[PDB]
Amino acid sequence: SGFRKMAFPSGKVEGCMVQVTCGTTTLNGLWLDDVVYCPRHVICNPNYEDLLIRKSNHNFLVQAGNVQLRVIGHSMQNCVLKLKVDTANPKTPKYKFVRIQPGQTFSVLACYNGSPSGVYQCAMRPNFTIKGSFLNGSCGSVGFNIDYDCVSFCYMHHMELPTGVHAGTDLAGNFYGPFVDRQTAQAAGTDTTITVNVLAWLYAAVINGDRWFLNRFTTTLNDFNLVAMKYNYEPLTQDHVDILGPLSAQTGIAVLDMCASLKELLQNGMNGRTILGSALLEDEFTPFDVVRQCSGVTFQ
Amino acid sequence: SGFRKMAFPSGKVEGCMVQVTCGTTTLNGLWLDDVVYCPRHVICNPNYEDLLIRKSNHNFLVQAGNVQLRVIGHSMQNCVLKLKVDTANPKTPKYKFVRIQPGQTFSVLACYNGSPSGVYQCAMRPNFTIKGSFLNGSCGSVGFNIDYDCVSFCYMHHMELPTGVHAGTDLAGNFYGPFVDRQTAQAAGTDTTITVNVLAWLYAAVINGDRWFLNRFTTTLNDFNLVAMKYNYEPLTQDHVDILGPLSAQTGIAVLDMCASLKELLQNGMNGRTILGSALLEDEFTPFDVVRQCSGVTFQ
Ligand SMILES: *[C@H](O)[C@H](C[C@@H]1CCNC1=O)NC(=O)[C@H](CC(C)C)NC(=O)[C@@H](NC(=O)OCc1cccc(Cl)c1)[C@@H](C)OC(C)(C)C
Ligand SMILES: *[C@H](O)[C@H](C[C@@H]1CCNC1=O)NC(=O)[C@H](CC(C)C)NC(=O)[C@@H](NC(=O)OCc1cccc(Cl)c1)[C@@H](C)OC(C)(C)C
């Protein structure tokens, strides 16, 4: 038992992290097979197409540890740079590039100078930001999930917004949300709480024996969504109800009954109690995270 | 910016995790050089000395992935078993066995069947328990810190207590706290909040721009400790004040001034605000964790 915000083991990703230096800029790259992926703002209101035609293969310094990789080609894919190197990474895991949906989670391997610093779990907020921990030089750090032996890369870090939240791209270089890799006034836009995840976390709570918030009451999906809206929760759909089925089945609490408990938690607060060690309703655990952690799934 | 509960990158430890099966028990082992370390309760109110003399080298099945390791010797060191194998782990990092102090933190690589499941950060509670996330079969998962390229192993998991908290040993097999690896009635004993860590976390908050809890007030170390005691906080010492010096210097808030803010947070609560995304005072970040995260230290 116990419930922690858990990241995937980072070993497969650590072996892909390299340092990319061009001119006065140093950041992280992701070395898979013979390609290094990195944010395009490594290159010297810009017009990165103009800026890249002015570059030479030799302008890009790529350190894999204490071994430099020779760049033999470069190209730009949206907001990422693909640096072709003459050496395939022998540590390349099986991988995919996936774009995730707001509400889904992933692990971030925060890196500086191509060296992993730490690993933590994030969710893609409904406003396409993430609340990460990124210092200057962390660009090119990646977010990922692991499914048995397959790494799905879903995020590369590009920038911080004025509210302290973070924005980036998928590994094809397409930003999450309406952001651009320029130093122009940009703002996150209003966020909402991920309702399905809060309910998943309440099920995790019951599995670990916090039950004080349960009740005999019930509600319909509609009447629930009426209350969710007032509290800036995002609407709960029948598909969310379905995804919560397994957790409902294991605890024997109908999804709509857990909605009634959430309703009262929203309207009354927590009255000094905590749930799973939190005094707030937590929304960065998906139903899958709960099942994975509360069932013991591993990865090779 | 941003502040997350960050674990160390787990790659160095993932390459040490093996599966140890003896009889009807399977758990995790730690393979360093030609020795596999694992909880002694893998072996068939027990008297483990009697139980081990009855065992044979061949009774211990050790899988490193899809490769079995031959056991060529065994011995017991307190509550851990040391299984001598005929193959040195080529992935053995530079490492040390350290015993940590209550209040210190470490990363846990939760494993099942020798396969890493997830990584998360823990603190050793003042009552020598940890609040982990451990399912049946997780014994032998280890806790660790990484200092540049050196892994300090500090924890091996042995058991869960009735309150859902966890107990284990250092890598020399000596339990943290008054626990024993028997199925006899055992209880955690009363915990306290790690005061120095709460203050460190308040400094992290200021570094990230939560300042609402600051005040013009001050207090002496004594008058602070008088209030800490009422709230079941552990006493703050001058040495804790000293360790908070750097964070005090960076924010320009004297340690004793931050104590005054903590005092008022203790006596008034948080009035619906949050600090670093928490509605509770967080005590599992050490002053070192704060500096490491808010300064960008890496590891090779
Ligand atoms: C890459 O290492 C780095 C990572 C960030 C540095 C600190 N934390 C990070 O996550 N990325 C950048 O430095 C990035 C480079 C540009 C060219 C993409 N710039 C930013 O992250 C800035 N964000 C930004 O431009 O927001 C829009 C904006 C424009 C004008 C005025 C304001 Cl207030 C906002 C960051 C570093 O700048 C701040 C938002 C002021 C922190
Ligand atoms: C090793 O894989 C495993 C890890 C735990 C299983 C579930 N979560 C874990 O962290 N360790 C054990 O199963 C361990 C084996 C013994 C021989 C060390 N046993 C326990 O963790 C039990 N703890 C325990 O004995 O506490 C004392 C006790 C005795 C009698 C009655 C009570 Cl209520 C407590 C656990 C599995 O048992 C519970 C505390 C009832 C969950």
Residue A40 DSSP label:
G
Instruction: Judge contact between A227 and A263, C-beta under 8 A.
Output: yes
Q: Do B1 and A135 touch (CB under 8 A)?
A: yes
- The response to whether residue A138 sits with its C-beta less than 6 Å from ligand 1 reads yes
C-beta neighbour count of A297 within 10 angstroms: 16
End-to-end CA distance of chain B: 23
Amino acid at B59: N
Instruction: Judge contact between A113 and A94, C-beta under 8 A.
Output: no
Q: Which residues in chain A have their CB less than 8 angstroms from residue B119's CB?
A: 6-10, 119
- Alpha-carbon gap, residue A228 to A236, rounded angstroms: 8
- Alpha-carbon gap, residue A179 to A187, rounded angstroms: 8
Q: Which of B71, B11, B15, B65 is nearest to B42 (CA)?
A: B71
- Alpha-carbon gap, residue B109 to B120, rounded angstroms: 7
- Alpha-carbon gap, residue A102 to A28, rounded angstroms: 25
Q: Which residues in chain B have their CB less than 8 angstroms from residue A205's CB?
A: none
Q: Which of A3, A5, A29 is nearest to A16 (CA)?
A: A29
A132 SS3 class: coil
Q: Which residue of A has its CA nearest to B295?
A: A135
End-to-end CA distance of chain A: 23
Cα radius of gyration rounded to whole Å, chain A = 21
Extract the tokens encoding B21.
């099966």
Torsion angle defined by CA atoms of residues B279, B281, B285 and B291, in that order, rounded to the nearest 10 degrees: 90
- The response to whether residue A45 sits with its C-beta less than 6 Å from ligand 1 reads no
Q: Of A22, A38, A122, A139, which residue is the catalytic one?
A: A139
Rounded to the nearest 10 degrees, what angle do helices B221-230 and B255-268 cross at? 30
The CATH number of A195-294, from 1.10.1840.10, 3.40.50.740, 3.40.50.1820, 1.20.990.10, is 1.10.1840.10
Q: Do A208 and B293 touch (CB under 8 A)?
A: no
- In what helix (H) or strand (E) does residue A249 lie, and over which residues does it extend? helix A245-251
Residues in chain A, overall count: 300
- Alpha-carbon gap, residue A117 to B299, rounded angstroms: 6
Which residues of chain B form beta strands (DSSP E)? 17-22, 25-32, 35-39, 60-64, 67-69, 71-77, 80-85, 94-97, 105-112, 115-123, 142-147, 150-160, 166-169
Q: Which of A143, A154, A17, A150 is nearest to A97 (CA)?
A: A154
Q: Of B41, B74, B157, B166, which residue is the catalytic one?
A: B41
Q: Please give the C-alpha separations between residue A74 and each of A56, A90, B18, in angstroms, as whole numbers.
A: 9, 21, 41
Q: B12-85 is classed in which CATH architecture? A: Beta Barrel (2.40)
B40 SS3 class: helix
- Alpha-carbon gap, residue B229 to B235, rounded angstroms: 7
Which candidate from A11, A120, A277 shows the least CB-CB separation from B6? A120
Q: What resolution does the deposited structure have, in angstroms?
A: 1.9
Q: Which of A28, A26, A81, A25 is nearest to A53 (CA)?
A: A81
Q: Which residue has the tokens 């307190």?
A: B78
- Alpha-carbon gap, residue B75 to B106, rounded angstroms: 27
Q: Do A296 and B137 touch (CB under 8 A)?
A: yes
Cross-strand partners of A159:
A167
Instruction: Judge contact between B140 and B159, C-beta under 8 A.
Output: no
How big is the CA angle at B210 (ends B205 and B211), to the nearest 5 degrees? 105
Centre of ligand 2 from the C-alpha of residue B183, in Å = 6
The reply to whether B139 belongs to the active site is: yes
Report the nearest atom of ligand 1 relative to the CA of B1.
8
Side-chain half-sphere CA neighbours of A271 within 13 A: 6
- The response to whether residue A51 sits with its C-beta less than 6 Å from ligand 1 reads no
Centre of ligand 1 from the C-alpha of residue B189, in Å = 48
Residue A151 DSSP label:
E
Rounded to the nearest 10 degrees, what angle do helices A255-268 and A195-207 cross at? 100
Q: Please give the C-alpha separations between residue A161 and each of A26, A47, A51, A194, B9, in angstroms, as whole numbers.
A: 20, 21, 24, 21, 26
Return the sign of the alpha-carbon dihedral for residues B281, A267, A276, A111: negative
Instruction: Judge contact between A259 and A241, C-beta under 8 A.
Output: no
Instruction: Judge contact between A142 and A157, C-beta under 8 A.
Output: yes
Q: Do A9 and B133 touch (CB under 8 A)?
A: no
Side-chain half-sphere CA neighbours of B69 within 13 A: 31
The DSSP annotation for A83-106 comes to EEESS--TTPPEEEE-PPPTT-EE
Distance of residue A153 Cα from the nearest chain B Cα, in angstroms:
17
Q: Which of A66, A157, A81 is nearest to A115 (CA)?
A: A66
**Helices assigned H by DSSP within chain B:** 11-14, 48-53, 195-207, 221-230, 238-243, 245-251, 255-268, 287-293
Centre of ligand 2 from the C-alpha of residue B151, in Å = 28
Q: What is the 3-state secondary structure (H, E, C) of A220-239?
A: CHHHHHHHHHHCCECCCCHH
- Alpha-carbon gap, residue B153 to A45, rounded angstroms: 48
Q: Kindly provide the b/e burial profile for residues B41-71, where b requires at least 16 CB atoms within 10 angstroms of the residue's own CB.
A: bbbeeeebeeeeeebeeeebebbbeeeebeb
Extract the tokens encoding B35.
């020795």
Instruction: Judge contact between B254 and A253, C-beta under 8 A.
Output: no
